[PDB]
Amino acid sequence: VIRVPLPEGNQLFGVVEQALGAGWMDVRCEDGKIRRCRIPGKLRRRVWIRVGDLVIVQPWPVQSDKRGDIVYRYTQTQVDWLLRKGKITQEFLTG
RNA sequence: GGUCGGGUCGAGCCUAGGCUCCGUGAGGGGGGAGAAGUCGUAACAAGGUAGCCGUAGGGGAACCUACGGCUCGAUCACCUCCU
Ligand SMILES: [Mg+2]
Ligand SMILES: [Mg+2]
């Protein structure tokens, strides 16, 4: 079929609003509470993330409010591919 | 031994008068770390206006300009002074 970063384990879907700075990313998920993603060191080299890139992250059971952590990105050949299956509704990106 | 009178040493207790210690503090100010946030290019080569020191004025910010000094300034010419 296809190998896509679905929610495996406890993953989250990160669609960011603004970069306050130094790696903090305010994310706007379907969950509601303002989460603030940060980044590991394996990908800070070869990839390039910005706004509008729906990507996958991972949250942390501490306070479940401001969490998230990048593990892998999405390429433009998947971001809109993930619409027809309805796995994610894009109206969590226009309001 | 008790009671009244007079002096003498007296800790505490109360008043107001100055000092400092002590945690909680509205609001303000700089310091140090994070370097996939934004604006520029000040320094190092003659860093593209040579850099730096004292004093005063100015500017989003590194910074700019006027007077007096230093070489820890590079290139061409002509002198000058010696080995
Ligand atoms: Mg310059
Ligand atoms: Mg200069």
Swiss-Prot record:
Keyword Protein biosynthesis annotated: yes
Coiled coil spans: none
Membrane-crossing segments per the record: none
Organism name: Pyrococcus abyssi (strain GE5 / Orsay)
Similarity comment text for this entry: Belongs to the eIF-1A family.
This protein's name: Translation initiation factor 1A
Lineage: Archaea, Methanobacteriati, Methanobacteriota, Thermococci, Thermococcales
Biological function: Seems to be required for maximal rate of protein biosynthesis. Enhances ribosome dissociation into subunits and stabilizes the binding of the initiator Met-tRNA(I) to 40 S ribosomal subunits.
Residues of the full protein shown: 13 to 107 of 113
Domain S1-like: 1-75
GO MF assignments: RNA binding; translation initiation factor activity
Keyword Protein biosynthesis included in the entry's annotation: yes
Alphabetical UniProt keywords: Initiation factor, Protein biosynthesis
